Amino acid sequence: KILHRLLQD
Amino acid sequence: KILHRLLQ
Amino acid sequence: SLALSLTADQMVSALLDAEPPILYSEYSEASMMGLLTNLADRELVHMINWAKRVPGFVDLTLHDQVHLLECAWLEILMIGLVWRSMEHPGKLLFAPNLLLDRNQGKCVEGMVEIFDMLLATSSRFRMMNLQGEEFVCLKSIILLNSGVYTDHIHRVLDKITDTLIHLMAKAGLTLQQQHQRLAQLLLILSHIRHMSNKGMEHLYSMSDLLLEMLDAHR
Amino acid sequence: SLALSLTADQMVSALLDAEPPILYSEYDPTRPFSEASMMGLLTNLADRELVHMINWAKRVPGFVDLTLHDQVHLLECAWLEILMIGLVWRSMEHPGKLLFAPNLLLDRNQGKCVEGMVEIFDMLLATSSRFRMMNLQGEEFVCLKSIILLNSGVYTFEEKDHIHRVLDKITDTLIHLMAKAGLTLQQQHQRLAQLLLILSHIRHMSNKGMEHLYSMSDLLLEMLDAHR
Numbered sequence: 001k002i003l004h005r006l007l008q009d
Numbered sequence: 010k011i012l013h014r015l016l017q
Numbered sequence: 018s019l020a021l022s023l024t025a026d027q028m029v030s031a032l033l034d035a036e037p038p039i040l041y042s043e044y045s046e047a048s049m050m051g052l053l054t055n056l057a058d059r060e061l062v063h064m065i066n067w068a069k070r071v072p073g074f075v076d077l078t079l080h081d082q083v084h085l086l087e088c089a090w091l092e093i094l095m096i097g098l099v100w101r102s103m104e105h106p107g108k109l110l111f112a113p114n115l116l117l118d119r120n121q122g123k124c125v126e127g128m129v130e131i132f133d134m135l136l137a138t139s140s141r142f143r144m145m146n147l148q149g150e151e152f153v154c155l156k157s158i159i160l161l162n163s164g165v166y167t168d169h170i171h172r173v174l175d176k177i178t179d180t181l182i183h184l185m186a187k188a189g190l191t192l193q194q195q196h197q198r199l200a201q202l203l204l205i206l207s208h209i210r211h212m213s214n215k216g217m218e219h220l221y222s223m224s225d226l227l228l229e230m231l232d233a234h235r
Numbered sequence: 236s237l238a239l240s241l242t243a244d245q246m247v248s249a250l251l252d253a254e255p256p257i258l259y260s261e262y263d264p265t266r267p268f269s270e271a272s273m274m275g276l277l278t279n280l281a282d283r284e285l286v287h288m289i290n291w292a293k294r295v296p297g298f299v300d301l302t303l304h305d306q307v308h309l310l311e312c313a314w315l316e317i318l319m320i321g322l323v324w325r326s327m328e329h330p331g332k333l334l335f336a337p338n339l340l341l342d343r344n345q346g347k348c349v350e351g352m353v354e355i356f357d358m359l360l361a362t363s364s365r366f367r368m369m370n371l372q373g374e375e376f377v378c379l380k381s382i383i384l385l386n387s388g389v390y391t392f393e394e395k396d397h398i399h400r401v402l403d404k405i406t407d408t409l410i411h412l413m414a415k416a417g418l419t420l421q422q423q424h425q426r427l428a429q430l431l432l433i434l435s436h437i438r439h440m441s442n443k444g445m446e447h448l449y450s451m452s453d454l455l456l457e458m459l460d461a462h463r
Protein backbone atom coordinates (compact mmCIF):
# COMPACT_ATOMS: atom_id res chain seq x y z
CA LYS A 1 0.00 0.00 0.00
CA ILE A 2 1.19 3.51 -0.85
CA LEU A 3 -0.18 4.97 2.39
CA HIS A 4 1.55 2.15 4.29
CA ARG A 5 4.93 2.99 2.76
CA LEU A 6 4.73 6.77 3.15
CA LEU A 7 3.92 6.36 6.85
CA GLN A 8 7.09 4.25 7.26
CA ASP A 9 9.56 6.55 5.46
CA LYS B 10 -45.68 15.32 0.60
CA ILE B 11 -46.73 12.80 3.26
CA LEU B 12 -44.39 14.53 5.71
CA HIS B 13 -46.24 17.79 4.99
CA ARG B 14 -49.61 16.38 6.05
CA LEU B 15 -48.24 14.54 9.10
CA LEU B 16 -46.62 17.73 10.42
CA GLN B 17 -49.90 19.67 10.14
CA SER C 18 -39.73 31.88 21.48
CA LEU C 19 -40.78 29.83 24.51
CA ALA C 20 -37.86 27.39 24.23
CA LEU C 21 -35.29 30.03 25.16
CA SER C 22 -37.14 30.96 28.32
CA LEU C 23 -37.15 27.44 29.70
CA THR C 24 -34.99 26.44 32.60
CA ALA C 25 -32.68 23.45 32.55
CA ASP C 26 -35.07 21.23 34.52
CA GLN C 27 -38.07 22.32 32.43
CA MET C 28 -36.08 21.53 29.28
CA VAL C 29 -35.17 18.10 30.67
CA SER C 30 -38.72 17.28 31.77
CA ALA C 31 -40.18 18.40 28.43
CA LEU C 32 -37.81 16.12 26.50
CA LEU C 33 -38.42 13.13 28.78
CA ASP C 34 -42.18 13.67 28.50
CA ALA C 35 -41.97 13.70 24.69
CA GLU C 36 -40.16 10.35 24.50
CA PRO C 37 -41.72 8.04 21.89
CA PRO C 38 -42.65 4.50 22.96
CA ILE C 39 -40.71 1.32 22.28
CA LEU C 40 -42.53 -0.57 19.52
CA TYR C 41 -42.65 -4.29 18.79
CA SER C 42 -41.93 -6.04 15.51
CA GLU C 43 -44.29 -8.41 13.72
CA TYR C 44 -44.84 -11.74 15.46
CA SER C 45 -34.16 -14.92 4.90
CA GLU C 46 -32.59 -11.67 3.73
CA ALA C 47 -36.03 -10.47 2.60
CA SER C 48 -37.73 -11.61 5.82
CA MET C 49 -35.44 -9.43 7.93
CA MET C 50 -35.56 -6.40 5.61
CA GLY C 51 -39.35 -6.55 5.78
CA LEU C 52 -39.30 -6.71 9.58
CA LEU C 53 -36.93 -3.73 9.79
CA THR C 54 -38.78 -1.70 7.13
CA ASN C 55 -42.13 -2.25 8.84
CA LEU C 56 -40.72 -1.35 12.26
CA ALA C 57 -39.01 1.81 11.00
CA ASP C 58 -42.23 2.77 9.19
CA ARG C 59 -44.28 2.76 12.40
CA GLU C 60 -41.52 4.52 14.36
CA LEU C 61 -41.49 7.45 11.92
CA VAL C 62 -45.08 8.31 12.84
CA HIS C 63 -44.06 8.53 16.50
CA MET C 64 -40.91 10.44 15.53
CA ILE C 65 -42.99 13.21 13.94
CA ASN C 66 -45.01 13.66 17.14
CA TRP C 67 -41.80 13.68 19.19
CA ALA C 68 -40.26 16.30 16.90
CA LYS C 69 -43.33 18.50 17.36
CA ARG C 70 -42.66 18.48 21.12
CA VAL C 71 -38.94 19.33 20.94
CA PRO C 72 -38.79 22.92 22.25
CA GLY C 73 -38.15 25.32 19.38
CA PHE C 74 -39.09 22.93 16.57
CA VAL C 75 -42.63 24.22 16.03
CA ASP C 76 -41.28 27.77 15.82
CA LEU C 77 -39.69 26.80 12.50
CA THR C 78 -41.67 27.05 9.28
CA LEU C 79 -43.34 23.99 7.77
CA HIS C 80 -40.66 23.75 5.08
CA ASP C 81 -37.76 23.84 7.55
CA GLN C 82 -39.43 21.24 9.78
CA VAL C 83 -39.73 18.89 6.79
CA HIS C 84 -36.09 19.55 5.89
CA LEU C 85 -34.69 18.70 9.34
CA LEU C 86 -36.70 15.48 9.57
CA GLU C 87 -35.79 14.34 6.05
CA CYS C 88 -32.10 14.85 6.87
CA ALA C 89 -32.10 13.40 10.39
CA TRP C 90 -34.63 10.55 10.39
CA LEU C 91 -32.20 7.64 10.05
CA GLU C 92 -29.83 9.28 12.55
CA ILE C 93 -32.68 9.51 15.07
CA LEU C 94 -33.73 5.89 14.52
CA MET C 95 -30.13 4.75 15.00
CA ILE C 96 -29.39 6.57 18.26
CA GLY C 97 -32.68 5.23 19.61
CA LEU C 98 -31.65 1.70 18.65
CA VAL C 99 -28.22 2.22 20.21
CA TRP C 100 -29.78 3.59 23.41
CA ARG C 101 -32.17 0.64 23.71
CA SER C 102 -29.27 -1.79 23.23
CA MET C 103 -27.03 -0.32 25.96
CA GLU C 104 -27.94 -2.94 28.57
CA HIS C 105 -27.63 -5.82 26.04
CA PRO C 106 -23.90 -6.03 25.21
CA GLY C 107 -23.12 -7.57 21.84
CA LYS C 108 -26.77 -7.35 20.73
CA LEU C 109 -29.02 -4.80 19.05
CA LEU C 110 -32.51 -4.51 20.56
CA PHE C 111 -34.54 -3.40 17.55
CA ALA C 112 -37.68 -4.37 19.48
CA PRO C 113 -38.30 -6.13 22.81
CA ASN C 114 -39.19 -9.21 20.72
CA LEU C 115 -36.41 -8.67 18.14
CA LEU C 116 -32.95 -8.88 19.73
CA LEU C 117 -30.22 -9.63 17.19
CA ASP C 118 -26.46 -10.22 17.23
CA ARG C 119 -23.88 -9.46 14.56
CA ASN C 120 -24.03 -13.01 13.17
CA GLN C 121 -27.71 -12.56 12.31
CA GLY C 122 -26.76 -9.25 10.70
CA LYS C 123 -24.81 -11.25 8.10
CA CYS C 124 -28.12 -12.58 6.76
CA VAL C 125 -28.60 -9.34 4.77
CA GLU C 126 -25.79 -8.41 2.38
CA GLY C 127 -23.72 -5.47 3.61
CA MET C 128 -25.60 -5.04 6.90
CA VAL C 129 -23.00 -6.68 9.19
CA GLU C 130 -20.67 -3.70 8.68
CA ILE C 131 -23.32 -1.24 9.87
CA PHE C 132 -24.27 -3.68 12.65
CA ASP C 133 -20.71 -3.63 14.01
CA MET C 134 -20.71 0.18 13.96
CA LEU C 135 -24.02 0.26 15.84
CA LEU C 136 -22.73 -2.25 18.40
CA ALA C 137 -19.57 -0.19 18.89
CA THR C 138 -21.69 2.92 19.50
CA SER C 139 -23.76 1.06 22.10
CA SER C 140 -20.66 -0.21 23.90
CA ARG C 141 -19.34 3.36 23.89
CA PHE C 142 -22.56 4.70 25.42
CA ARG C 143 -22.44 1.90 27.99
CA MET C 144 -18.83 2.54 29.03
CA MET C 145 -19.63 6.25 29.42
CA ASN C 146 -22.66 5.45 31.63
CA LEU C 147 -24.87 7.55 29.36
CA GLN C 148 -27.92 8.74 31.30
CA GLY C 149 -31.45 9.08 30.00
CA GLU C 150 -31.43 12.84 30.54
CA GLU C 151 -28.27 13.06 28.42
CA PHE C 152 -29.69 10.80 25.70
CA VAL C 153 -32.78 12.91 24.99
CA CYS C 154 -30.58 16.01 24.81
CA LEU C 155 -28.36 14.34 22.20
CA LYS C 156 -31.33 13.13 20.14
CA SER C 157 -32.77 16.66 20.06
CA ILE C 158 -29.38 18.02 18.95
CA ILE C 159 -29.32 15.61 16.00
CA LEU C 160 -32.76 16.78 14.86
CA LEU C 161 -31.86 20.48 14.94
CA ASN C 162 -28.24 20.25 13.74
CA SER C 163 -28.24 17.68 10.93
CA GLY C 164 -29.96 19.91 8.36
CA VAL C 165 -29.19 23.41 9.62
CA TYR C 166 -26.40 23.88 7.04
CA THR C 167 -28.53 22.66 4.11
CA ASP C 168 -30.05 31.70 13.74
CA HIS C 169 -32.97 30.56 15.90
CA ILE C 170 -31.83 26.94 15.61
CA HIS C 171 -28.37 27.87 16.90
CA ARG C 172 -29.90 29.66 19.90
CA VAL C 173 -31.79 26.46 20.75
CA LEU C 174 -28.65 24.34 20.33
CA ASP C 175 -26.85 26.53 22.88
CA LYS C 176 -29.73 26.06 25.33
CA ILE C 177 -29.42 22.28 24.99
CA THR C 178 -25.67 22.56 25.58
CA ASP C 179 -26.34 24.48 28.80
CA THR C 180 -28.77 21.71 29.75
CA LEU C 181 -26.11 19.04 29.18
CA ILE C 182 -23.57 20.90 31.33
CA HIS C 183 -26.20 21.48 34.02
CA LEU C 184 -26.81 17.72 34.16
CA MET C 185 -23.08 16.98 34.48
CA ALA C 186 -22.53 19.65 37.14
CA LYS C 187 -25.48 18.35 39.17
CA ALA C 188 -23.96 14.84 39.10
CA GLY C 189 -20.75 16.17 40.68
CA LEU C 190 -18.48 16.37 37.63
CA THR C 191 -15.66 18.91 37.82
CA LEU C 192 -15.40 21.66 35.22
CA GLN C 193 -12.76 19.65 33.34
CA GLN C 194 -14.86 16.48 33.46
CA GLN C 195 -17.88 18.46 32.23
CA HIS C 196 -16.36 19.81 29.02
CA GLN C 197 -14.48 16.56 28.40
CA ARG C 198 -17.70 14.55 28.62
CA LEU C 199 -19.55 17.11 26.48
CA ALA C 200 -16.91 16.73 23.76
CA GLN C 201 -16.96 12.92 23.96
CA LEU C 202 -20.74 12.83 23.47
CA LEU C 203 -20.74 15.28 20.55
CA LEU C 204 -17.92 13.48 18.72
CA ILE C 205 -20.06 10.32 18.82
CA LEU C 206 -22.65 12.25 16.80
CA SER C 207 -20.16 12.38 13.92
CA HIS C 208 -20.08 8.57 13.88
CA ILE C 209 -23.88 8.48 14.03
CA ARG C 210 -23.84 10.76 10.99
CA HIS C 211 -21.41 8.37 9.29
CA MET C 212 -23.61 5.35 10.04
CA SER C 213 -26.68 7.14 8.67
CA ASN C 214 -24.98 8.08 5.39
CA LYS C 215 -23.75 4.52 4.82
CA GLY C 216 -27.20 3.21 5.73
CA MET C 217 -28.98 5.58 3.35
CA GLU C 218 -26.69 4.68 0.44
CA HIS C 219 -27.65 1.03 0.88
CA LEU C 220 -31.37 1.82 1.24
CA TYR C 221 -31.79 3.52 -2.15
CA SER C 222 -29.70 0.71 -3.66
CA MET C 223 -32.23 -2.03 -2.86
CA SER C 224 -43.40 1.90 2.48
CA ASP C 225 -45.01 5.09 1.17
CA LEU C 226 -43.46 7.26 3.88
CA LEU C 227 -40.02 5.76 3.72
CA LEU C 228 -39.82 6.19 0.01
CA GLU C 229 -40.13 9.91 0.33
CA MET C 230 -37.76 10.06 3.30
CA LEU C 231 -35.40 7.85 1.28
CA ASP C 232 -35.92 9.97 -1.85
CA ALA C 233 -34.77 13.14 -0.08
CA HIS C 234 -31.22 11.70 -0.06
CA ARG C 235 -31.17 11.11 -3.83
CA SER D 236 3.90 9.11 24.91
CA LEU D 237 4.85 12.77 25.30
CA ALA D 238 1.44 13.86 23.96
CA LEU D 239 -0.22 13.61 27.38
CA SER D 240 2.63 15.52 29.06
CA LEU D 241 2.21 18.54 26.76
CA THR D 242 0.59 21.65 28.19
CA ALA D 243 -2.12 23.54 26.31
CA ASP D 244 0.31 26.10 24.91
CA GLN D 245 2.78 23.36 23.96
CA MET D 246 -0.03 21.51 22.18
CA VAL D 247 -1.00 24.62 20.20
CA SER D 248 2.53 25.55 19.13
CA ALA D 249 3.18 21.94 18.11
CA LEU D 250 0.06 21.88 15.93
CA LEU D 251 0.81 25.27 14.36
CA ASP D 252 4.35 24.22 13.39
CA ALA D 253 3.05 20.98 11.82
CA GLU D 254 0.78 22.89 9.43
CA PRO D 255 1.22 21.92 5.76
CA PRO D 256 1.73 24.64 3.15
CA ILE D 257 -0.92 26.07 0.84
CA LEU D 258 -0.37 24.47 -2.56
CA TYR D 259 -1.03 25.95 -5.99
CA SER D 260 -3.03 24.31 -8.75
CA GLU D 261 -1.90 23.75 -12.32
CA TYR D 262 -2.43 26.73 -14.63
CA ASP D 263 -2.64 25.26 -18.14
CA PRO D 264 -4.09 27.71 -20.70
CA THR D 265 -4.04 24.87 -23.24
CA ARG D 266 -6.58 22.82 -21.28
CA PRO D 267 -10.20 23.66 -22.13
CA PHE D 268 -12.89 24.55 -19.61
CA SER D 269 -14.60 21.18 -19.15
CA GLU D 270 -15.57 18.55 -16.60
CA ALA D 271 -12.48 16.44 -17.28
CA SER D 272 -10.01 19.32 -16.92
CA MET D 273 -11.71 20.65 -13.78
CA MET D 274 -11.66 17.19 -12.20
CA GLY D 275 -8.08 16.70 -13.37
CA LEU D 276 -7.17 20.02 -11.75
CA LEU D 277 -8.81 19.09 -8.44
CA THR D 278 -7.45 15.52 -8.51
CA ASN D 279 -3.90 16.71 -9.14
CA LEU D 280 -4.24 19.29 -6.35
CA ALA D 281 -5.58 16.90 -3.70
CA ASP D 282 -2.99 14.32 -4.78
CA ARG D 283 -0.11 16.62 -3.82
CA GLU D 284 -1.94 17.72 -0.66
CA LEU D 285 -2.15 14.10 0.53
CA VAL D 286 1.65 13.79 0.64
CA HIS D 287 1.80 16.82 2.93
CA MET D 288 -1.14 15.52 4.99
CA ILE D 289 0.61 12.22 5.68
CA ASN D 290 3.67 14.15 6.89
CA TRP D 291 1.44 16.44 8.97
CA ALA D 292 -0.30 13.49 10.65
CA LYS D 293 3.05 12.19 11.92
CA ARG D 294 3.48 15.44 13.88
CA VAL D 295 0.00 15.33 15.47
CA PRO D 296 0.77 14.53 19.13
CA GLY D 297 -0.11 10.94 19.96
CA PHE D 298 -0.38 9.75 16.35
CA VAL D 299 3.02 8.02 16.16
CA ASP D 300 2.25 6.14 19.38
CA LEU D 301 -0.40 4.23 17.41
CA THR D 302 0.43 1.09 15.49
CA LEU D 303 1.01 1.34 11.75
CA HIS D 304 -2.26 -0.47 11.03
CA ASP D 305 -4.29 2.10 12.97
CA GLN D 306 -2.45 5.06 11.41
CA VAL D 307 -3.36 3.72 7.96
CA HIS D 308 -6.97 3.25 9.10
CA LEU D 309 -7.38 6.76 10.51
CA LEU D 310 -5.97 8.43 7.39
CA GLU D 311 -8.11 6.32 5.05
CA CYS D 312 -11.28 7.30 6.92
CA ALA D 313 -10.47 10.99 7.38
CA TRP D 314 -8.42 12.20 4.39
CA LEU D 315 -11.32 13.87 2.58
CA GLU D 316 -12.64 15.43 5.80
CA ILE D 317 -9.19 16.92 6.44
CA LEU D 318 -8.92 18.25 2.89
CA MET D 319 -12.38 19.80 3.26
CA ILE D 320 -11.84 21.58 6.58
CA GLY D 321 -8.60 22.91 5.11
CA LEU D 322 -10.45 24.20 2.05
CA VAL D 323 -13.19 25.65 4.28
CA TRP D 324 -10.58 27.38 6.46
CA ARG D 325 -8.73 28.91 3.49
CA SER D 326 -12.07 30.20 2.13
CA MET D 327 -13.15 32.10 5.27
CA GLU D 328 -12.07 35.55 4.05
CA HIS D 329 -13.60 34.96 0.58
CA PRO D 330 -17.38 35.06 1.08
CA GLY D 331 -19.22 33.06 -1.57
CA LYS D 332 -16.03 31.54 -3.00
CA LEU D 333 -13.92 28.45 -2.35
CA LEU D 334 -10.15 28.97 -2.38
CA PHE D 335 -8.94 25.60 -3.61
CA ALA D 336 -5.61 27.33 -4.26
CA PRO D 337 -4.38 30.94 -4.28
CA ASN D 338 -4.62 30.74 -8.09
CA LEU D 339 -7.91 28.77 -8.04
CA LEU D 340 -10.82 30.70 -6.50
CA LEU D 341 -14.21 29.25 -7.45
CA ASP D 342 -17.80 30.25 -6.75
CA ARG D 343 -20.89 28.05 -6.86
CA ASN D 344 -21.59 28.93 -10.51
CA GLN D 345 -18.27 27.41 -11.58
CA GLY D 346 -19.05 24.42 -9.35
CA LYS D 347 -21.86 23.53 -11.75
CA CYS D 348 -19.24 22.51 -14.33
CA VAL D 349 -19.04 19.03 -12.76
CA GLU D 350 -22.31 17.11 -12.52
CA GLY D 351 -23.56 17.00 -8.94
CA MET D 352 -20.69 18.98 -7.40
CA VAL D 353 -22.64 22.20 -6.78
CA GLU D 354 -24.58 20.58 -3.93
CA ILE D 355 -21.31 19.86 -2.12
CA PHE D 356 -19.98 23.29 -3.10
CA ASP D 357 -23.00 24.83 -1.36
CA MET D 358 -22.35 22.76 1.76
CA LEU D 359 -18.68 23.79 1.79
CA LEU D 360 -19.67 27.44 1.34
CA ALA D 361 -22.14 27.32 4.24
CA THR D 362 -19.53 25.69 6.49
CA SER D 363 -17.04 28.40 5.51
CA SER D 364 -19.69 31.02 6.24
CA ARG D 365 -20.31 29.43 9.64
CA PHE D 366 -16.60 29.66 10.50
CA ARG D 367 -16.51 33.32 9.43
CA MET D 368 -19.51 34.18 11.62
CA MET D 369 -17.95 32.37 14.60
CA ASN D 370 -14.59 34.10 13.91
CA LEU D 371 -12.78 30.77 14.05
CA GLN D 372 -9.17 31.24 15.14
CA GLY D 373 -6.20 29.39 13.68
CA GLU D 374 -5.38 27.82 17.05
CA GLU D 375 -8.92 26.44 17.19
CA PHE D 376 -8.71 25.23 13.58
CA VAL D 377 -5.56 23.16 14.14
CA CYS D 378 -7.26 21.54 17.15
CA LEU D 379 -10.38 20.71 15.11
CA LYS D 380 -8.31 19.21 12.29
CA SER D 381 -6.39 16.98 14.70
CA ILE D 382 -9.69 15.89 16.27
CA ILE D 383 -10.99 14.76 12.86
CA LEU D 384 -7.83 12.71 12.25
CA LEU D 385 -8.09 10.86 15.57
CA ASN D 386 -11.88 10.51 15.83
CA SER D 387 -13.23 9.70 12.36
CA GLY D 388 -11.94 6.12 12.35
CA VAL D 389 -11.84 5.27 16.05
CA TYR D 390 -15.01 3.10 16.09
CA THR D 391 -14.16 1.07 12.97
CA PHE D 392 -10.98 -0.76 14.05
CA GLU D 393 -6.54 -0.74 24.18
CA GLU D 394 -5.44 1.37 21.21
CA LYS D 395 -8.84 3.08 21.36
CA ASP D 396 -8.15 4.05 24.99
CA HIS D 397 -4.98 5.99 24.11
CA ILE D 398 -6.71 7.93 21.31
CA HIS D 399 -9.55 8.88 23.65
CA ARG D 400 -7.13 10.29 26.24
CA VAL D 401 -5.35 12.34 23.57
CA LEU D 402 -8.76 13.56 22.37
CA ASP D 403 -9.55 14.72 25.91
CA LYS D 404 -6.26 16.63 25.96
CA ILE D 405 -7.26 18.45 22.77
CA THR D 406 -10.60 19.28 24.39
CA ASP D 407 -8.70 20.79 27.33
CA THR D 408 -6.68 22.77 24.78
CA LEU D 409 -9.77 24.22 23.08
CA ILE D 410 -11.22 25.28 26.44
CA HIS D 411 -7.87 26.81 27.39
CA LEU D 412 -7.91 28.87 24.18
CA MET D 413 -11.45 30.15 24.77
CA ALA D 414 -10.85 30.97 28.44
CA LYS D 415 -7.73 32.84 27.31
CA ALA D 416 -9.88 34.82 24.84
CA GLY D 417 -12.06 36.22 27.64
CA LEU D 418 -15.11 34.01 27.13
CA THR D 419 -17.17 33.13 30.19
CA LEU D 420 -17.54 29.55 31.39
CA GLN D 421 -20.95 29.39 29.69
CA GLN D 422 -19.59 30.85 26.44
CA GLN D 423 -16.70 28.37 26.52
CA HIS D 424 -18.96 25.31 26.65
CA GLN D 425 -21.31 26.78 24.04
CA ARG D 426 -18.52 27.56 21.56
CA LEU D 427 -16.94 24.14 22.17
CA ALA D 428 -20.27 22.55 21.25
CA GLN D 429 -20.72 24.74 18.16
CA LEU D 430 -17.28 23.77 16.85
CA LEU D 431 -17.74 20.04 17.42
CA LEU D 432 -21.20 19.99 15.83
CA ILE D 433 -19.68 21.39 12.63
CA LEU D 434 -17.54 18.24 12.51
CA SER D 435 -20.78 16.32 12.00
CA HIS D 436 -21.43 18.37 8.85
CA ILE D 437 -17.84 17.87 7.65
CA ARG D 438 -18.34 14.11 8.00
CA HIS D 439 -21.54 14.42 5.97
CA MET D 440 -19.79 16.33 3.18
CA SER D 441 -16.99 13.75 3.03
CA ASN D 442 -19.37 10.79 2.78
CA LYS D 443 -21.38 12.50 0.04
CA GLY D 444 -18.07 13.43 -1.57
CA MET D 445 -16.60 9.93 -1.42
CA GLU D 446 -19.83 8.48 -2.85
CA HIS D 447 -19.46 10.55 -6.03
CA LEU D 448 -15.72 9.83 -6.16
CA TYR D 449 -15.75 6.02 -6.34
CA SER D 450 -18.48 6.23 -9.00
CA MET D 451 -16.61 8.33 -11.57
CA SER D 452 -3.33 9.20 -8.85
CA ASP D 453 -2.50 5.74 -7.52
CA LEU D 454 -2.44 7.06 -3.95
CA LEU D 455 -5.95 8.50 -4.31
CA LEU D 456 -7.21 5.23 -5.82
CA GLU D 457 -6.12 3.41 -2.66
CA MET D 458 -7.53 6.08 -0.34
CA LEU D 459 -10.75 6.00 -2.37
CA ASP D 460 -10.68 2.18 -2.29
CA ALA D 461 -10.96 2.12 1.52
CA HIS D 462 -14.50 3.57 1.52
CA ARG D 463 -15.94 0.86 -0.74
Ligand SMILES: O=C(O)CCCCOc1ccc(C2=C(c3ccc(O)cc3)[C@@H]3C[C@@H](S(=O)(=O)Oc4cccc(Cl)c4)[C@H]2O3)cc1
Nearest residue numbers: 053054057094095098125126127128131216219220224227
Ligand atom coordinates in the same frame (compact mmCIF):
# COMPACT_ATOMS: atom_id res chain seq x y z
O1 LIG E 1 -37.50 0.18 -0.61
C1 LIG E 1 -38.19 0.32 0.37
O2 LIG E 1 -39.47 0.70 0.31
C2 LIG E 1 -37.76 0.15 1.81
C3 LIG E 1 -36.78 1.25 2.20
C4 LIG E 1 -37.00 1.72 3.62
C5 LIG E 1 -36.40 0.70 4.56
O3 LIG E 1 -36.34 1.27 5.82
C6 LIG E 1 -35.44 0.92 6.76
C7 LIG E 1 -34.83 -0.27 6.72
C8 LIG E 1 -33.96 -0.66 7.62
C9 LIG E 1 -33.63 0.12 8.64
C10 LIG E 1 -32.74 -0.28 9.54
C11 LIG E 1 -32.56 -0.06 10.85
C12 LIG E 1 -33.30 0.41 11.86
C13 LIG E 1 -32.75 0.97 12.91
C14 LIG E 1 -33.48 1.43 13.91
C15 LIG E 1 -34.80 1.33 13.90
O4 LIG E 1 -35.49 1.79 14.92
C16 LIG E 1 -35.37 0.76 12.86
C17 LIG E 1 -34.63 0.31 11.87
C18 LIG E 1 -31.12 -0.50 11.09
C19 LIG E 1 -30.15 0.48 10.47
C20 LIG E 1 -30.44 0.26 8.99
S1 LIG E 1 -29.02 -0.15 8.04
O5 LIG E 1 -28.27 0.99 7.75
O6 LIG E 1 -28.28 -1.31 8.37
O7 LIG E 1 -29.50 -0.27 6.48
C21 LIG E 1 -29.33 -1.48 5.90
C22 LIG E 1 -29.70 -2.62 6.49
C23 LIG E 1 -29.52 -3.80 5.92
C24 LIG E 1 -28.94 -3.85 4.72
C25 LIG E 1 -28.56 -2.73 4.14
CL1 LIG E 1 -27.84 -2.71 2.61
C26 LIG E 1 -28.75 -1.57 4.73
C27 LIG E 1 -31.42 -0.89 9.10
O8 LIG E 1 -30.96 -1.55 10.21
C28 LIG E 1 -34.24 1.30 8.66
C29 LIG E 1 -35.12 1.69 7.77
